[PDB]
Amino acid sequence: DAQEKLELAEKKATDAEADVASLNRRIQLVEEELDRAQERLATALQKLEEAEKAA
Amino acid sequence: DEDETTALVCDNGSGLVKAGFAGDDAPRAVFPSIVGRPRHQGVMVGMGQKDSYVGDEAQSKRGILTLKYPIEHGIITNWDDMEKIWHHTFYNELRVAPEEHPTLLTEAPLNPKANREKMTQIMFETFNVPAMYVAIQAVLSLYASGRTTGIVLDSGDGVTHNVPIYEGYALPHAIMRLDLAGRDLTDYLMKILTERGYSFVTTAEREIVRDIKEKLCYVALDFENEMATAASSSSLEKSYELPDGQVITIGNERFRCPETLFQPSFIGMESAGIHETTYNSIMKCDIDIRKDLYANNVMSGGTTMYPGIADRMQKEITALAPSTMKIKIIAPPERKYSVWIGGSILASLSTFQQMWITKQEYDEAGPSIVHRKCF
Amino acid sequence: DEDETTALVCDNGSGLVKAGFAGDDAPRAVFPSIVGRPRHQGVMVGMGQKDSYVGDEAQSKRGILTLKYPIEHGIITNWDDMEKIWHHTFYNELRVAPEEHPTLLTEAPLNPKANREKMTQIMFETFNVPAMYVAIQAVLSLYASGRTTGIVLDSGDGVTHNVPIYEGYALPHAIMRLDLAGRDLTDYLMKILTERGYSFVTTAEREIVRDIKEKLCYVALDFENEMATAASSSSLEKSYELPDGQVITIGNERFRCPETLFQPSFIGMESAGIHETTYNSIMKCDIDIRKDLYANNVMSGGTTMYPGIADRMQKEITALAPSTMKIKIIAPPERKYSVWIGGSILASLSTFQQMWITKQEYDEAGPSIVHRKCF
Amino acid sequence: DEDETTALVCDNGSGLVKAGFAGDDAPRAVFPSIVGRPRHQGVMVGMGQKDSYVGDEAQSKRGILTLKYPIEHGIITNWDDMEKIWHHTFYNELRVAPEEHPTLLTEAPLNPKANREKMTQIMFETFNVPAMYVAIQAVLSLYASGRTTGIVLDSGDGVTHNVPIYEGYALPHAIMRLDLAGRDLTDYLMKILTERGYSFVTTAEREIVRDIKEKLCYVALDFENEMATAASSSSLEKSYELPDGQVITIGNERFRCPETLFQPSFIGMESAGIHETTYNSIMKCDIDIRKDLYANNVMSGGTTMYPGIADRMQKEITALAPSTMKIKIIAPPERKYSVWIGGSILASLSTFQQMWITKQEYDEAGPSIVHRKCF
Ligand SMILES: Nc1ncnc2c1ncn2[C@@H]1O[C@H](COP(=O)(O)OP(=O)(O)O)[C@@H](O)[C@H]1O
Ligand SMILES: Nc1ncnc2c1ncn2[C@@H]1O[C@H](COP(=O)(O)OP(=O)(O)O)[C@@H](O)[C@H]1O
Ligand SMILES: Nc1ncnc2c1ncn2[C@@H]1O[C@H](COP(=O)(O)OP(=O)(O)O)[C@@H](O)[C@H]1O
Q: What is the Cα–Cα distance from C129 to C101, expressed in whole angstroms?
A: 6
Q: What is the Cα–Cα distance from C260 to C180, expressed in whole angstroms?
A: 8
Q: What is the Cα–Cα distance from B23 to B9, expressed in whole angstroms?
A: 10
Dihedrals φ, ψ of B69, to 5°?
-115, 115
Instruction: Note whether D375 and D109 are within 8 A (CB).
Output: yes
**B49 & B116 share domain:** no
**D226 & D109 share domain:** no
Q: Kindly state whether D110 is in contact with chain C, defined as any CB-CB distance less than 8 angstroms.
A: yes
Calculate the alpha carbon distances from C183 to C74, C190, D85, D174 in Å: 11, 11, 43, 15
From D218, D257, D298, D303, mutation site for ligand 3 pocket: most ligand atoms within 8 A of C-beta:
D303
B67: three-class secondary structure by DSSP: strand
Instruction: Note whether B130 and B102 are within 8 A (CB).
Output: yes
CA angle in degrees (0–180, nearest 5) for D282-D286-D291: 55
**C233 & C359 share domain:** no
The two beta strands, C16-21 and D163-166, are unpaired
For C113-153, give the DSSP string. HHHHHHHHHHHHHTS--SEEEEEEHHHHHHHHHT-SSEEEE
Measured between alpha carbons, how far apart are the two ends of chain B, in Å? 33
CA angle in degrees (0–180, nearest 5) for D112-D114-D116: 90
Interface of A with B in 27-46 (CB under 8 A): none
Q: What is the CA radius of gyration of chain A?
A: 22
**C216 & C75 share domain:** no
Chain D environment of B177 (Cβ under 8 Å): 194, 199, 201
Burial of residue D292 (CB within 10 Å: 0-12, 13-18, 19+) is: buried
Q: What is the CA radius of gyration of chain D?
A: 21
CA distance B135 to chain A (A): 29
Dihedrals φ, ψ of B52, to 5°?
-150, 150
Of B243, B267, B291, which one is at a domain's C-terminal end?
A: B267
**C85 & C14 share domain:** yes
- Single-letter residue type at B375: F
The two beta strands, D150-154 and D163-166, are antiparallel
D177: three-class secondary structure by DSSP: coil
- The closest ligand to the CA of C215 turns out to be 2
Ligand 1 atom nearest to B17, measured from its CA: 23
Contact B292/C63, CB-based, under 8 Å?
yes
Calculate the alpha carbon distances from D248 to B51, B117, C72, D113, D240 in Å: 37, 21, 51, 42, 5
Adjacency order of strands within the sheet including D163-166: D169-170, D163-166, D150-154, D297-300, D329-330
From B31, B214, B339, B344, mutation site for ligand 1 pocket: most ligand atoms within 8 A of C-beta:
B214
Helices in C245-320 by DSSP H: which ranges? 253-256, 274-283, 287-294, 309-318
- Single-letter residue type at D298: V
**Which residue pairs, CB below 8 angstroms and at least 24 apart, start in C201-205?**
C201/D177, C201/D178, C201/D179, C201/D270, C202/B286, C202/D269, C202/D270, C203/C62, C203/C65, C203/C66, C203/C67, C203/D270, C204/B286, C204/B287, C204/B288, C204/C62, C204/C63, C205/B286, C205/B287
The length of chain D, given as a count of residues: 375
CA angle in degrees (0–180, nearest 5) for D354-D359-D362: 90
**D197 & D237 share domain:** yes
Adjacency order of strands within the sheet including B53-54: B53-54, B35-38, B65-68
Helix and strand totals (H; E) in chain B: 14, 18
CATH number at residue C240: 3.90.640.10
B134: three-class secondary structure by DSSP: strand
C261: three-class secondary structure by DSSP: helix
Tally Cβ neighbours within 10 Å of residue D200.
21
DSSP summary character for residue C64: G
Q: What is the Cα–Cα distance from D262 to D313, expressed in whole angstroms?
A: 9
Instruction: Note whether C240 and C212 are within 8 A (CB).
Output: yes
How many domains does one find in chain D? 4
DSSP summary character for residue C42: B
Dihedrals φ, ψ of B251, to 5°?
-105, -110
Burial of residue D354 (CB within 10 Å: 0-12, 13-18, 19+) is: exposed
Instruction: Note whether C83 and C126 are within 8 A (CB).
Output: yes
Dihedrals φ, ψ of B135, to 5°?
-105, 155
**D298 & D327 share domain:** yes
Q: What is the Cα–Cα distance from C348 to C100, expressed in whole angstroms?
A: 16
- Cα four-point dihedral sign D12, D13, D15, D20: negative
- Single-letter residue type at D285: C
- Single-letter residue type at D366: G
Top residue of D185, D199, D209 to mutate, by most chain B CBs within 10 Å, is D199
Q: What is the Cα–Cα distance from D360 to B139, expressed in whole angstroms?
A: 62
- Single-letter residue type at B174: A
CATH number at residue D62: 2.30.36.70
Q: What is the Cα–Cα distance from C312 to C317, expressed in whole angstroms?
A: 8
Calculate the alpha carbon distances from D109 to B133, D116, D172 in Å: 50, 10, 9
Q: What is the Cα–Cα distance from B307 to B310, expressed in whole angstroms?
A: 8
- Please give the method by which this entry was determined: cryo-EM
For B73-105, give the DSSP string. TTEE--HHHHHHHHHIIIIIII---GGGS-EEE
Helices in B270-334 by DSSP H: which ranges? 274-283, 287-294, 309-318
Residue from the list D171, D179, D270 with its beta carbon closest to the beta carbon of C39: D270
Dihedrals φ, ψ of C32, to 5°?
-70, 150
B226 contacts: CB under 8 Å, gap ≥ 6? B220, B236, B252, B255
Which chains have 3+ CB pairs within 8 A of B? A, C, D
CA angle in degrees (0–180, nearest 5) for D205-D207-D209: 70
The two beta strands, B329-330 and C71-72, are unpaired
Angle between helices B182-195 and B203-216 (to 10 degrees): 100
Contact B326/A25, CB-based, under 8 Å?
yes
CA angle in degrees (0–180, nearest 5) for B67-B68-B71: 140
D167 contacts: CB under 8 Å, gap ≥ 6? D148, D149
CA atoms within 13 A on the CB side of C189: 30
C295 contacts: CB under 8 Å, gap ≥ 6? C325, C326, C327, C328
D214: three-class secondary structure by DSSP: helix
**Nearest CA-CA partner of B310 in B127, B153, B161:** B153
**C26 & C93 share domain:** yes
CA C266 to chain centre: 21
The two beta strands, C8-12 and C103-107, are parallel
B338 contacts: CB under 8 Å, gap ≥ 6? B140, B141, B144, B145, B300, B301, B332
Instruction: Note whether B308 and B221 are within 8 A (CB).
Output: yes
Going along chain B, which residue ranges are E strands?
8-12, 16-21, 29-32, 35-38, 53-54, 65-68, 71-72, 75-76, 103-107, 131-136, 150-155, 163-166, 169-170, 238-241, 247-250, 297-301, 329-330, 357-358
Instruction: Note whether A8 and A16 are within 8 A (CB).
Output: no
**B23 & B127 share domain:** yes
Q: Is B289 in the pocket of ligand 1 (CB under 6 A)?
A: no
CATH number at residue B157: 3.30.420.40
**D157 & D192 share domain:** no
Adjacency order of strands within the sheet including C65-68: C53-54, C35-38, C65-68
Reported as type and span, the H/E element at residue B373 is: helix B370-373
D221: three-class secondary structure by DSSP: coil
Residue from the list D75, D112, D177 with its beta carbon closest to the beta carbon of C196: D112
Q: What is the Cα–Cα distance from B257 to D297, expressed in whole angstroms?
A: 57
Beta bridge partner(s), residue B103:
B8, B132
- Cα four-point dihedral sign C205, D138, C196, D76: positive
**Nearest CA-CA partner of D76 in D42, D134, D119, D131:** D119
Calculate the alpha carbon distances from D231 to A6, B366, C111, C337 in Å: 54, 15, 52, 57
Q: What is the Cα–Cα distance from D139 to D146, expressed in whole angstroms?
A: 11
CA angle in degrees (0–180, nearest 5) for D29-D31-D37: 150
B143: three-class secondary structure by DSSP: helix
**Nearest CA-CA partner of C75 in C109, C30, C29:** C109
B12: three-class secondary structure by DSSP: strand
D299: three-class secondary structure by DSSP: strand
D278 contacts: CB under 8 Å, gap ≥ 6? D151, D153, D162, D176, D297, D313, D317
Following CA atoms B139, B140, B141, B144 in sequence, which dihedral angle do they give, to the nearest 10 degrees? 130
- Single-letter residue type at B175: I
DSSP summary character for residue C10: E
For B158-181, give the DSSP string. S-B--EEEETTEE-GGG---BS--
Task: List b or e across D158-192, with b for residues whose CB sees 16 or more CB atoms inside 10 angstroms.
Answer: bbbbbbbbbeeebbbbbbbbbbbbbbbbbbbbbbb
Range of the domain at B283: 136-181+271-332
Q: Is B206 in the pocket of ligand 1 (CB under 6 A)?
A: no
CA atoms within 13 A on the CB side of B361: 16
Instruction: Note whether C225 and C211 are within 8 A (CB).
Output: no
* HEC letters along chain A: CHHHHHHHHHHHHHHHHHHHHHHHHHHHHHHHHHHHHHHHHHHHHHHHHHHHHHC
**B188 & B286 share domain:** no
Q: What is the Cα–Cα distance from C343 to C19, expressed in whole angstroms?
A: 10
Calculate the alpha carbon distances from C156 to B156, C9, C138, C358 in Å: 56, 18, 12, 30
**Nearest CA-CA partner of B199 in B229, B261, B158, B244:** B244
Instruction: Note whether C122 and C82 are within 8 A (CB).
Output: yes
Instruction: Note whether C245 and B317 are within 8 A (CB).
Output: no
Dihedrals φ, ψ of C165, to 5°?
-130, 135
**D167 & D299 share domain:** yes
Dihedrals φ, ψ of D163, to 5°?
-115, 120
CA atoms within 13 A on the CB side of B162: 27
Instruction: Note whether A18 and B323 are within 8 A (CB).
Output: no
Helices in chain D by DSSP H: which ranges? 56-60, 79-87, 113-125, 137-145, 182-195, 203-216, 223-230, 253-259, 274-283, 290-294, 309-318, 338-347, 361-365, 370-373
Helices in B240-335 by DSSP H: which ranges? 253-259, 274-283, 287-294, 309-318
Chain D environment of B179 (Cβ under 8 Å): 201
Give the nearest chain C residue to B143 (CA atoms).
Answer: C44
**Nearest CA-CA partner of C153 in C305, C17, C264, C315:** C305
Q: What is the Cα–Cα distance from B119 to D353, expressed in whole angstroms?
A: 69
Q: What is the Cα–Cα distance from C36 to C70, expressed in whole angstroms?
A: 11
Tell me the longest C-alpha to C-alpha distance in chain A.
Answer: 74
Chain C environment of B136 (Cβ under 8 Å): 43
Following CA atoms C330, C332, C334, C336 in sequence, which dihedral angle do they give, to the nearest 10 degrees? 60
- Single-letter residue type at C53: Y
- Cα four-point dihedral sign D327, D333, D336, D339: negative
Adjacency order of strands within the sheet including B163-166: B169-170, B163-166, B150-155, B297-301, B329-330
C216: three-class secondary structure by DSSP: helix
Give the nearest chain B residue to D190 (CA atoms).
Answer: B110
For D112-158, give the DSSP string. -HHHHHHHHHHHHHTS--SEEEEEEHHHHHHHHHT-SSEEEEE--SS
Contact C243/B171, CB-based, under 8 Å?
no
Beta bridge partner(s), residue D330:
D298
From B336, B339, B340, B341, mutation site for ligand 1 pocket: most ligand atoms within 8 A of C-beta:
B336
Q: What is the Cα–Cα distance from A36 to A39, expressed in whole angstroms?
A: 5
